[PDB]
């Protein structure tokens, strides 16, 4: 792809984080802590899952960023509406305001309803995410495999400002402690 020149500097919004997450000083990395991280509750925090938003909001244009997923067993990545539900249980779907892919139990899937199987021959260590607001497109690229396409959501109905979306996943296995990292431009 030739989307690299729309690169944007994403940082994580601490106030949206689940209370067990640890965000680095530079706001470019996030991992699951082994306990509550001693923050106050607020209406922005994702309560049920290890999720956090980017601080940036997008309502126009083309945007691109990259995320490092090295050595993780489970994660979700993409974009979501600013107005997505934060509390309680929900599914990741465009009807609920999410345009995402994930890794879970050694398979990759797109967050459609129901979920869609992805076909990835080279397990990615870094994911590229491209949003074209006007076109209604969210695309995912395998940086480890020469930028090969993973998935495209089209005819998207964003219906509001978009935020970068992250889920570091639970660590029940002891094998999913590694962080998500926003990669340098
Ligand atoms: O999105 C905005 C402002 N907007 C709209 C168009 C571009 C821009 O910068 N403000 C919000 N405040 C709280 C929720 S969204
Ligand atoms: O779901 C959509 C479009 N829609 C319908 C409801 C909200 C929204 O964004 N596009 C897809 N592209 C690939 C698989 S689903």
Curated annotation (Swiss-Prot):
Instruction: Answer yes or no on keyword Lipid metabolism.
Output: no
Per UniProt, subcellular location reads as: Cytoplasm; Cytoplasmic vesicle, Autophagosome; Nucleus; Cytoplasm, P-body
Signal peptide annotation: none
Q: Does the UniProt entry include the keyword Coiled coil?
A: yes
A Gene Ontology cellular component where this protein is annotated is:
autophagosome
Question: Which biological process terms from the Gene Ontology are attached to this UniProt entry?
Answer: negative regulation of innate immune response; negative regulation of NF-kappaB transcription factor activity; negative regulation of protein deubiquitination; positive regulation of autophagy; positive regulation of cell cycle; positive regulation of protein binding; protein autoubiquitination; protein destabilization
Its induction note reads: Up-regulated by IFN.
Q: Name one GO molecular function term.
A: zinc ion binding
Principal location? cytoplasm
- Modification comment: Autoubiquitinated; does not lead to its proteasomal degradation. Deubiquitinated by USP4; leading to its stabilization. Autoubiquitinated.
| Keyword list, A-Z | Cell cycle, Coiled coil, Cytoplasm, Cytoplasmic vesicle, DNA-binding, Metal-binding, Nucleus, Ribonucleoprotein, RNA-binding, Transferase, Ubl conjugation, Ubl conjugation pathway, Zinc, Zinc-finger
Where would I find the B30.2/SPRY domain in this sequence?
8-185
Q: Which family does it belong to?
A: Belongs to the TRIM/RBCC family.
Its domain description in UniProt is:
The coiled-coil is necessary for the cytoplasmic localization.
Q: How does it assemble?
A: Homotrimer. Component of a SCF(SKP2)-like complex containing CUL1, SKP1, TRIM21 and SKP2. Interacts with CALR, CUL1, FBXW11, HSPA5, IKBKB, IRF3, SKP1 and VCP. Interacts with SKP2; the interaction with SKP2 does not depend on an intact F-box domain. Interacts (via N-terminus and C-terminus) with DCP2 (via N-terminus and C-terminus). Interacts (via C-terminus) with IRF8 (via C-terminus). Interacts with ULK1, BECN1 and with ATG8 family members, including GABARAP, GABARAPL1, GABARAPL2 and MAP1LC3C/LC3C. Interacts with TRIM21 and SQSTM1/sequestosome 1. Interacts with IRF3.
Q: Describe its function.
A: E3 ubiquitin-protein ligase whose activity is dependent on E2 enzymes, UBE2D1, UBE2D2, UBE2E1 and UBE2E2. Forms a ubiquitin ligase complex in cooperation with the E2 UBE2D2 that is used not only for the ubiquitination of USP4 and IKBKB but also for its self-ubiquitination. Component of cullin-RING-based SCF (SKP1-CUL1-F-box protein) E3 ubiquitin-protein ligase complexes such as SCF(SKP2)-like complexes. A TRIM21-containing SCF(SKP2)-like complex is shown to mediate ubiquitination of CDKN1B ('Thr-187' phosphorylated-form), thereby promoting its degradation by the proteasome.
Q: What is this protein called?
A: E3 ubiquitin-protein ligase TRIM21
Q: Which organism is it from?
A: Mus musculus
Question: Taxonomic classification, please?
Answer: Eukaryota, Metazoa, Chordata, Craniata, Vertebrata
Stretch of the intact protein here: 291 to 468 of 470
